From a paper:
Lymphocytic choriomeningitis virus (LCMV) is the prototypic member of the Arenaviridae family and belongs to the Old World (OW) arenavirus together with Lassa virus (LASV), which are distinct from the New World (NW) arenavirus [e.g. Machupo virus (MACV) and Junin virus (JUNV)]. As a segmented negative-sense single-stranded RNA virus (sNSRV), arenavirus encodes a large polymerase (L) to form a ribonucleoprotein complex (RNP) together with the genomic-length RNA encapsidated by viral nucleoprotein (NP) and facilitate virus replication and transcription. Arenavirus also encodes a RING finger Z matrix protein as a regulator of RNA synthesis. Previous studies have shown that the arenavirus Z protein forms a species-specific complex with the L protein and inhibits RNA synthesis initiation by impairing the catalytic activity of the L protein, which is known to be essential for the balance of infection and further initiation of virion assembly; however, the mechanism remains unclear.
In the LCMV L–Z complex structure, L and Z form a heterodimer with a molar ratio of 1:1. The final model of the LCMV L–Z complex includes residues 1–1814 of L and residues 28–74 of Z. The Z protein was found to bind at the bottom of the interface between the core lobe of the PA-like domain and the palm subdomain of the RdRp core. The position of Z partially blocks the product exit tunnel for the releasing nascent RNA product. Although the full-length Z was used to generate the L–Z complex, only its zinc finger domain can be built in the complex structure, suggesting that its N-/C-terminal portions are flexible and do not participate in the interaction with L. The zinc finger domain of LCMV-Z contains a single α-helix and two β-strands and harbors two zinc ions by residues C32–C35–C51–C54 and C45–H48–C65–C68 to form two zinc fingers, which are conserved with that observed in LASV-Z. The LCMV L–Z interaction comprises a set of hydrophobic interactions, hydrogen bonds, and van de Waals interactions with a large intermolecular contact surface of ~780 Å2, which is 20% of the ~4,000 Å2 total area of the molecular face of Z. The interacting residues of Z are located on the surface at the side of the two zinc-binding sites, including P29, S34, C35, W36, Q37, C54, L57, L58, V61, P66 and L67. Compared with apo LCMV-L, the core lobe, head lobe, and clamp domain of the PA-like region have a 1.7° orientation shifting apart from the RdRp core with the binding site of Z as the fixed point. With the binding of Z, only one α-helix can be observed, and most parts of the α-ribbon motif lack interpretable cryo-EM density, suggesting that these parts have a flexible architecture. Moreover, an additional conformational change of an α-helix in the palm subdomain can be observed in the LCMV L–Z complex.
Residue numbers in the entry:
A (entry chain B): 27 to 74
B (entry chain A): 1 to 190, 200 to 306, 315 to 355, 370 to 400, 411 to 465, 472 to 506, 524 to 784, 857 to 877, ...
Write the structure that this text describes.
């Protein structure tokens, strides 16, 4: 990967989980996975 | 000595034409010997030669006897006592007119233009006196750049002038010396640093060149500068905990910003919270949006077109009454044998009369003349007179239709016709969004407020009722004032329904057809924000809020509503950012009136609380994109400056505020008086005395850091009833504002140019003192200043603005016009943002009035550039044009001074006076100001390259101060107003490790800049995640598209031109849009709007007008050629199918070894349409005449261009309001515009009806009428009137394009679904038009493409890439690159 933060929290220095192309938190991932199936950011299926 | 005199004596009578007017002077010239007499005689001869030659050439009889204008008027017997005394070169007297001719020959372009404008004004001054005398003036001038003439051949004049030249130097040797009049003679009439001038510099360019060296020490060492810096800091940081201010720079808590926004205007906007309350208040704010949401529910209407067409010829109040009987009569033979607004019989002019003032105008206009027999004397005579405008200009069939209605009148019937129809709230249903019908009613209550500037003079029931069409049922307007000013409108339905309001038509063009593009823009936006945390019932609330916001902005457009929604970009970029100026929230607060302009604020705050509320930083990129776009939603308002005078006063104020606090010296003199020297003494002394704790916004540069900058560059360490009276009493300006803005008297217009540079002092070049004048440009937020000066000063300024440009071309940081540098700036900025280092995207404030030419002079006359004779001089020309600029003279515009004088006299005869009004009081107690001259000027945009140079070096120094103190060198950029500073990793880990130190860094970088003339604005930020260099924002990785920035630009600028070019500008702007992310399905709808506009103008849609309205994102890899070819490949679907394999064969056998000249013979343009047939027979297989003859489209500019020499030739020759443009394009394109083979003029109607109705011509449409599906071989009684000559085949115009498209963009353009100098040369390769394309100057297959371009005069395909700049990098959606052909 590239940068080191949630490509979507725009915060949260380091605790996140790896997506296909960006980083996402424990969180972040919950509040997206509770609405849809795609990664609305990288246009791919989110992690589990 | 005398040999040249004898040569002249034998040349005059033996080589010059012998005319009677020349002889009188020739004898005197050849009979004199004294050299001074010889020169004056020769000059007079050379003057009179050109005078008589030009006079005869223009046909104007020459004024040999020096007759005056009054003499010219009296010699014909007319007495005109009193006229300005002028002597025109030539004159033509006719029965009712006068022609006055002025001639002059100038060499230098500048003096030529000056003489041109002077003579034009001199001729135009007496225009009104000529008009009131019973005559008129025909303006004419003769500005010749040569001395050629009939009476003398080229060699004769050349040798004559050379002989007088040599004799002139010979006389100059003797006592015939002339101080500088000799210079005017010899060096004038016979750029790049004219040094030919003398030097009168003394005792003033020593003060000015002394203050630039007193105090500065421009040679300090390379380690005496470090020890200087480290004693400038730590003499700041040790005075920050108690001394000045806490840096203006504070961290951001997003909740803090949002609450501080919410608590703005703690007066009346007081936290109206719930949505339903906000929407219920919105749907009742203005008086209009109270209809736009309301939920309501041809024998005639063509007699009007006729009765109206014959109206523009005449206009009189004695007329327009019997012009209305003809219409009331018809409204008694259609309801009696059986619109009407209740007192109205809609008359000709969009007028609305009352049925009782008519039917009473008669019986006095008739009784003045057997009452029953008294009719049919004006109800038949009028019909005959109106038909008198018969086939004269093609009076069409509407003449016999009315001959039935009109005589069907009587007096037992006309005594009750108006007596028969004697019958003289809707609330705001607020559910109506996600509903087209609430915008699809603005899109028709504007087209009936817009058509409305299109009324005419036309000198209760006098109210210009327009009509609001809509599905079926129609409601009116009612108003009383026309033109383009304001008026109080109305509405009427079936019940009354006086929904009065007050608007201006010019502001209302955007929603004129656009009901499916706005409702899809505001429906794409809410597809970005399917953000989780919002899936609860806030999405519908956001959608309703955003819809109710767009409605408010479109319905109530005004300047405040623009500046407000524009400011919401800084707040969002601060909420996503990481530092922000402390004084931000005073840069967002406007003053709000007109409850619409408050509910806009409430909607904005509600939207920001909703999106940027709790649970944030989970999708923050998408919310940021959403909100920056909603910020740019402010372009939907038009940029058309509300008022004129109240927007000139503002620009003058923005000019004159800092001068109030520095010094100004109203109205200097042409020779700098001692007072000016004293005031410049004082200002130059204050400018360079600014202590190390400055007042933080005042102009000044400190001579202790400035020394460090200059000495670090010299050293090699930094490189590589009441109205009338109250106006006449304010007409006193005539009593106050004068403030004024032997030689060969006759020959002044001749050879000798009166004004020209000579000995130049340090103040001015001896012609003037660099005069100027200011006016406002037009922009979205605030009107920018503009300085415009006469042409000579505009020529001098170019030397400085070019020298500095080239000088900074050696240093590699600036990006203003180095375009290649912008690409590298973008690459570096993107690599930065991708990682997360700071970006101190700053933006400097007051860059206009806080920079002075004195400062560049200081910075130049201290640098130590190289050796002599090329550098030691040269810079002594920039450093003496800058001294000219230092003493410029801007002019207080006349309206502003008039207004200030009026205000002063009103107040004094009868407070809140602003600063720039008290000065007017002081001075108008004495002498009125007219000119202002002060050091701190830097005319905005004048030196916009010198400023860039200085900014570049200062930013290269401050990012060294920071480097030596903190430990890191941050790169930078510049545009001359913006900037960026991409700190590196070491200073970005510090913002999370320690913020209180980066706070000091941003406190100090804004303090040095204070010690120089650079004041950082409160709108800057330093974010670890956005950027904004020249309005190109960035988020992590990709770039914010700014959809609403480009849609709002395509929808404007429908300019009055020929539609085949109006539809080229838009086909450029649409590719501009699709460069960024405007999705294709919106660009199609913009194009459909434009075509609907034209179709409303009643202009036939020929298939070359505007591009396909079915597009793949195929705006990549296609020119304007490919759009049109893909159109004509769908308009005729199966004919195109052979004419696209014939072209394949032609391209196969043209490139290698065939054709290349004989193609032009078969291009056969010499003759008629069987070229397709012969060329199909030449190399192919069966090709009937069906493809050729049948498909044919009507072409309006086939023979001559339609009024208001090929195309590419004109374009190469071109290398040497908006809602009152449309209301004119709909007027010209309906009248006599098309042109015939004999310069005749026709209508589009008389010609577009016969081509489909009055011939065996089949004309049915496919959304665009491809008329005459047959024109069988055009075998016909051809050239009927024009409608057969004027229509050219289609499947040929497809061949020439689908071939030109095949060398230019590839070979695939056929399969089944570079620059100006070159073009001029391969136009030269056929030399017939060169005779016209040359004198205006003061590769593999390119010949084929230019040739095919010259013939097809509508279409681009070469003249495109040399007329509009294309784009290089596209960002396109991925749901448009899958649906491709
Ligand atoms: Mn900026
Ligand atoms: Zn996260
Ligand atoms: Zn992802």
């Amino acid at each position: 990967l590239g940068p080191l933060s949630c490509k979507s929290c725009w915060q949260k220095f380091d605790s996140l989980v790896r997506c296909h192309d960006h980083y996402l938190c424990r969180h972040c991932l919950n509040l997206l996975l509770s609405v849809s199936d795609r990664c609305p950011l990288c246009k791919y299926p989110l992690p589990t | 000595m005398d040999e040249i005199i004898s040569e002249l004596r034998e040349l005059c009578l033996n080589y010059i034409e012998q005319d009677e007017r020349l002889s009188r002077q020739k004898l005197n010239f050849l009979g004199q010997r004294e050299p001074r007499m010889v020169l004056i005689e020769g000059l007079k001869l050379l003057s009179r030669c050109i005078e008589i030659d030009s006079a005869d050439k223009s046909g104007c009889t020459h004024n040999h006897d020096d007759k005056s204008v009054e003499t010219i008027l009296v010699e014909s017997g007319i007495v005109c006592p009193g006229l300005p005394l002028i002597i025109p070169d030539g004159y033509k007297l006719i029965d009712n007119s006068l022609i006055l001719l002025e001639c002059f020959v100038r060499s230098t372009p500048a003096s030529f233009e000056k003489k041109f404008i002077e003579d034009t004004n001199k001729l135009a001054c007496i225009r009104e006196d000529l008009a009131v005398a019973g005559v008129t003036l025909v303006p004419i001038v003769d500005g010749r750049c040569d001395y050629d003439n009939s009476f003398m051949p080229e060699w004769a004049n050349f040798k004559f002038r050379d002989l007088l030249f040599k004799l002139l130097e010979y006389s100059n040797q003797n006592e015939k010396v002339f101080e500088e009049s000799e210079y005017f003679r010899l060096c004038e009439s016979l750029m790049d640093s004219m040094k030919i001038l003398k030097d009168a510099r003394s005792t003033h360019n020593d003060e000015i060149m002394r203050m630039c060296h007193e105090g500065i020490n421009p040679n300090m060492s390379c380690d005496d500068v470090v020890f200087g810096i480290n004693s400038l800091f730590s003499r700041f940081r040790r005075d920050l905990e108690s001394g000045k201010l806490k840096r203006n720079f504070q961290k951001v808590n997003p909740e803090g910003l949002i609450k501080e926004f919410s608590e703005l205007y703690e007066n009346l906007a007081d936290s109206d919270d719930i949505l339903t309350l906000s929407r219920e208040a919105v749907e009742s704010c203005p008086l209009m949006r109270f209809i736009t949401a309301e939920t309501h529910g041809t024998e005639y209407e063509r007699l009007l077109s006729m009765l109206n067409k014959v109206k523009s010829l005449k206009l009189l109040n004695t007329r327009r009454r019997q012009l209305l009987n003809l219409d009331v009569l018809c409204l008694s033979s259609l309801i009696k044998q059986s619109c009407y607004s209740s007192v109205n019989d809609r008359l000709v002019s969009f007028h609305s009369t009352k049925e009782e003032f008519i039917r009473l105008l008669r019986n006095r206009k008739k009784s003045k003349v057997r009452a029953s027999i008294s009719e049919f004397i004006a109800k038949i005579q009028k019909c005959l007179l109106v038909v008198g405008l018969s086939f004269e200009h093609y009076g069409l069939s509407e003449h016999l239709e009315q001959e039935c209605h009109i005589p069907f009148t009587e007096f037992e019937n006309f005594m009750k016709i108006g007596a028969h129809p004697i019958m003289y709230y809707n609330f705001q249903p607020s559910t109506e969004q996600l509903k087209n019908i609430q915008s699809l009613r603005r899109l028709s209550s504007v087209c009936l407020a817009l058509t409305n500037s299109m009324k005419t003079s036309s000198v209760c029931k006098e109210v210009f009722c327009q009509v609001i069409k809509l599905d079926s049922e129609e409601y009116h307007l009612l108003y009383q004032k026309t033109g383009e000013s304001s008026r109080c409108y109305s509405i009427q339905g079936p019940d009354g329904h006086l929904i009065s309001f007050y608007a201006d038509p010019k502001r209302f063009f955007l929603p004129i057809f656009s009901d499916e593009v706005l409702y899809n823009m505001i429906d794409i936006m809410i597809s970005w924000i399917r953000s989780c945390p919002d899936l609860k019932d806030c999405l519908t609330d956001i959608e309703v809020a955003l819809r109710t916001l767009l409605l408010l902005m479109l319905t109530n457009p005004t300047k405040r509503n623009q500046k407000q929604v524009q400011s919401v970009r800084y707040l969002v970029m601060a909420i996503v950012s990481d530092f922000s100026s402390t004084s931000l929230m005073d840069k967002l607060r406007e003053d709000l009136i007109t409850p619409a302009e408050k509910v806009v604020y409430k909607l904005l705050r509600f939207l920001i609380k909703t999106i940027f509320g709790t649970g944030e930083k989970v999708l923050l990129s998408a919310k940021f994109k959403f909100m920056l776009n909603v910020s740019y939603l402010c372009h939907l308002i038009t940029k058309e400056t509300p008022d004129r005078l109240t927007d000139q006063i503002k620009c003058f104020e923005k000019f004159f505020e800092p001068k109030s606090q520095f010094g100004f010296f109203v109205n200097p003199k042409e020779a700098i008086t001692p007072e000016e020297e004293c005031v410049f003494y004082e200002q130059m002394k204050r400018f360079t005395s600014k202590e190390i704790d400055c007042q933080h916004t005042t102009p000044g540069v400190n001579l202790e850091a400035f020394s460090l900058m200059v000495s670090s560059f010299n050293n090699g360490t930094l490189i590589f009833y009441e109205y009338k009276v109250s106006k006449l009493v304010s007409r006193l300006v005539i009593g106050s504002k004068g403030e004024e803005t032997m030689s060969a008297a006759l020959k002044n217009l001749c050879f000798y140019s009166e004004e020209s540079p000579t000995s130049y002092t340090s103040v001015g070049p001896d012609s003037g003192r660099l005069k100027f004048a200011l006016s406002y440009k037009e922009q979205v937020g605030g009107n920018r200043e503009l300085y415009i000066g006469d042409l000579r000063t505009k020529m001098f300024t170019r030397l400085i603005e070019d020298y500095f440009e080239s000088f900074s071309s050696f240093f590699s940081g600036s990006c203003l016009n180095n375009d290649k540098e912008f690409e590298n700036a973008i690459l570096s900025m993107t690599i930065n943002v991708r990682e997360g280092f700071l970006n101190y995207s700053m933006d400097h404030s007051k860059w206009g009035p806080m920079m002075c030419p004195f400062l560049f002079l200081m910075f130049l006359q201290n640098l130590k550039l190289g050796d002599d004779q090329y550098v030691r001089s040269g810079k002594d020309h920039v450093s003496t044009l800058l001294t000219w600029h230092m003493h410029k003279l801007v002019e207080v515009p006349f309206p502003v001074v008039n207004a200030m004088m009026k205000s002063y006299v009103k107040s004094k005869l009868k407070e809140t006076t602003v600063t720039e009004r008290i000065f007017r009081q002081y001075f108008e107690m004495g002498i009125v100001p007219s000119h202002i001259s002060s050091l701190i000027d830097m005319g905005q945009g004048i030196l916009h390259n010198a400023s860039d140079f200085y900014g570049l070096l200062s930013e290269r120094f401050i990012n060294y101060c920071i480097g030596v103190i903190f430990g890191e060198r941050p790169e930078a950029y510049t545009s001359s107003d913006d900037q960026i500073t991409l700190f590196d990793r070491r200073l970005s880990d510090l913002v999370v490790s320690d913020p209180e130190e980066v706070l000091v860094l941003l406190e100090f970088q804004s303090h040095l800049s204070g010690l120089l003339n650079k004041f950082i604005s409160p709108k800057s930020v330093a974010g670890r995640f956005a950027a904004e260099f020249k309005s190109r924002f960035y988020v992590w990785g990709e770039e914010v598209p700014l959809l609403t920035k480009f849609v709002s630009a395509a929808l404007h600028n429908v300019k009055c031109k020929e539609p085949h070019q109006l539809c080229e500008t838009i086909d450029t702007i649409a590719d501009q849009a699709i460069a960024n992310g405007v999705p294709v399905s919106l660009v199609n709808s913009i194009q459909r709007r434009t075509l609907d506009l034209l179709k409303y103008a009643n202009f036939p849609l020929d298939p070359f007008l505007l591009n396909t309205n079915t597009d793949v994102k195929d705006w990549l890899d296609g020119s304007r050629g490919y759009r049109i070819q893909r159109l004509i490949e769908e308009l005729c679907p199966n004919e195109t199918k052979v004419v696209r394999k014939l072209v394949r064969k032609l391209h196969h056998k043209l490139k290698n070894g065939e054709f290349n000249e004989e193609f032009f013979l078969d291009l056969f343009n010499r003759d008629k349409k069987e070229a397709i047939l012969q060329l199909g027979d030449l190399l192919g297989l069966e090709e009937d005449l069906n493809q050729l003859a049948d498909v044919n489209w009507l072409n309006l500019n086939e023979m001559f261009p339609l009024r208001m020499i090929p195309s590419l030739i004109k374009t190469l020759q071109n290398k040497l309001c908006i809602s009152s443009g449309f209301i004119g394009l709909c007027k010209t394109l309906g009248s006599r515009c098309v042109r015939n083979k004999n310069r005749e003029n026709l209508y589009i109607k008389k010609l577009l009806e016969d081509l489909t109705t009055d011939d065996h011509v089949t004309r049915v449409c496919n959304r665009d009428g491809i008329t005459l599906y047959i024109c069988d071989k055009q075998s016909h009684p051809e050239a009927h009137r024009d409608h057969i000559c004027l229509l050219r085949p289609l499947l040929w115009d497809y061949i020439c394009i689908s071939l030109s498209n095949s060398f230019e963009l590839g070979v695939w353009v056929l399969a089944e679904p570079k620059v100006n100098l070159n073009q001029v040369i391969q136009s030269v390769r056929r030399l017939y038009p060169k005779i016209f394309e040359d004198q205006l100057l003061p590769i593999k297959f390119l010949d084929l493409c230019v040739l095919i371009d010259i013939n097809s005069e509508s279409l681009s395909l070469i003249s495109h890439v040399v007329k509009w700049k294309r784009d290089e990098h596209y960002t396109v959606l991925f749901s448009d690159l899958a649906n491709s052909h």
